[PDB]
């Protein structure tokens, strides 16, 4: 059934350009400790990252954060096809621009603050049309790659010309904002989210499952707790992670 | 950044014609024990006072009351440029006129009651356009320097003839009433004002910063204590001192 088709799960290493798999699964795919892979997903999108063995990971699941996950247009519980891409050479000219909803207030040398310490001997592989997030200046600023000289994908070299027009581009409809609330934005609810997610995993990801079976899915979930942890943020994150509709009643 | 540009801070000396500086700062700026200095600020205006040594004052700050503060049309935190002006000589004849909304109820010889004891061997350096305040007779009367013979600036000597044409003037737009509230009109609330100020200082003085930075400022502040302490007085003082708008809800 092709062992190259894996299920996207939560990541442990919160770095952008990195995917995590189990070592025994890496023994099946003949992969190495740091090979530039190629991730294909729904709606025909590719993303290039680096493979690292995560011992706490299962064989069927693959770890990746929200930044990479959204580039593949996939949610937690989807299947993606991974294949090694060793034909990646160093880049020359890379056209990149920030999004207007993340630079809405700040200005100046964004490169010195965000770009430079992000590729300072990092050799991160980026493909045309990708959106990477760099956290600096006490906020979050996203960038979308316009065009790279070794199109479509290439590895950023220390001798790579980084073009920056200085024009805050717009965000598209299908381009979900990384600035929203996800499971990587809530803590102190380890035991809670596990119970919550396993109650809303299947009935929200596969409606055909519960309608073809006699299992009765839950209709109401009550959250106790003192005002502080963020019960509002929990339900909001679930709807933005599973892709379900979100309508709040204050 | 020019070591002659300082920041206006709260005053210990409530005298109208005094500007307090730190000891080492006057050594860097070459100022004497009574040299008439020239202050410049926003809205392109000038003012003349007398520099003194303040041990409780810091190097990068300068103490001055609301009189000098309003004459430069600046608030606590604005930038001003101080410079030595040794070409200021004694005055000859000075024509000054009071404001209509500060004499309503009293009449007679204003010169002998307010003016004469106020400039009584004080050598106060006034300038055309300055608005100083004299308190006495269980009230407060505001005067505006209309015209001085040694234009523009001169020192009021106890031999200087002081003319009073007796003609009430209109109130200009940017002329904040000195009868209103300020940080120097409230007491007993030392640590209270200390906490309150630094909570609403930044978001009120620079809204642009918080709209650009990813830092959340306090939205709602509650004031405890028994009635009669002056709850409303504190709030209105902040708005009047920061230039921010004020709308009360009884």
From Swiss-Prot, chains A, B:
The modification Phosphoserine is found at residue 17. Phosphorylated by tyrosine kinases in response to T-cell antigen receptor activation. Phosphorylated in mitotic cells. Changing residue 159 to R: No effect on binding to DERL1. Changing residue 135 to H: In FTDALS6 and IBMPFD1; properly assembles into a hexameric structure; cultured cells expressing the mutant protein show a marked general increase in the level of ubiquitin-conjugated proteins and impaired protein degradation through the endoplasmic reticulum-associated degradation (ERAD) pathway; shows strongly reduced affinity for ADP and increased affinity for ATP; shows normal ATPase activity according to PubMed:16321991 while according to PubMed:25878907 and PubMed:25125609 shows increased ATPase activity; no defect in ubiquitin-dependent protein degradation by the proteasome; impaired autophagic function; defective maturation of ubiquitin-containing autophagosomes; decreased interaction with CAV1 and UBXN6; decreased endosome to lysosome transport via multivesicular body sorting pathway of CAV1; decreases the arsenite-induced stress granules (SGs) clearance process. Changing residue 135 to S: In IBMPFD1; impaired autophagic function. Necessary for the fragmentation of Golgi stacks during mitosis and for their reassembly after mitosis. Involved in the formation of the transitional endoplasmic reticulum (tER). The transfer of membranes from the endoplasmic reticulum to the Golgi apparatus occurs via 50-70 nm transition vesicles which derive from part-rough, part-smooth transitional elements of the endoplasmic reticulum (tER). Vesicle budding from the tER is an ATP-dependent process. Belongs to the AAA ATPase family. Homohexamer. Forms a ring-shaped particle of 12.5 nm diameter, that displays 6-fold radial symmetry. Part of a ternary complex containing STX5A, NSFL1C and VCP. NSFL1C forms a homotrimer that binds to one end of a VCP homohexamer. The complex binds to membranes enriched in phosphatidylethanolamine-containing lipids and promotes Golgi membrane fusion. Binds to a heterodimer of NPLOC4 and UFD1, binding to this heterodimer inhibits Golgi-membrane fusion. Interaction with VCIP135 leads to dissociation of the complex via ATP hydrolysis by VCP. The PIM (PUB-interaction motif) motif mediates interaction with the PUB domain of RNF31. This is Transitional endoplasmic reticulum ATPase. It comes from Homo sapiens (Human). The lineage of its organism: Eukaryota, Metazoa, Chordata, Craniata, Vertebrata.
């Amino acid at each position: 059934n092709r062992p190259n088709r894996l299920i996207v799960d939560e990541a442990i290493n919160e770095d952008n350009s990195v995917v995590s798999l189990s070592q025994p699964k890496m023994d099946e795919l003949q992969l190495f400790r740091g090979d530039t892979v190629l991730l294909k997903g729904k709606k025909r999108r590719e993303a290039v990252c680096i493979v690292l063995s995560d011992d706490t990971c299962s064989d069927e699941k693959i770890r990746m954060n929200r930044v990479v996950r959204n580039n593949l247009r996939v949610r937690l519980g989807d299947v993606i096809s991974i294949q090694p891409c060793p034909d990646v050479k160093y880049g020359k000219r890379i056209h990149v621009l920030p999004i207007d909803d993340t630079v809405e207030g700040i200005t100046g040398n964004l490169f010195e603050v965000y770009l430079k310490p992000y590729f300072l001997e990092a050799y991160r592989p980026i493909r045309k049309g990708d959106i990477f997030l760099v956290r600096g200046g006490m906020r979050a600023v996203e960038f979308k790659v316009v065009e790279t000289d070794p199109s479509p994908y290439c590895i950023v070299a220390p001798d790579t010309v980084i073009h920056c027009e200085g024009e805050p581009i717009k965000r598209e409809d299908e381009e979900e904002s990384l600035n929203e609330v996800g499971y990587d934005d809530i803590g102190g609810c380890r035991k809670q989210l596990a119970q919550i997610k396993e109650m809303v995993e299947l009935p929200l990801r596969h409606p055909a499952l519960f309608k073809a079976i006699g299992v009765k899915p839950p209709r109401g979930i009550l959250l106790y707790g003192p005002p502080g942890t963020g019960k509002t943020l929990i339900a909001r994150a679930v709807a933005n992670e599973t892709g379900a509709f979100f309508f709040l009643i204050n």
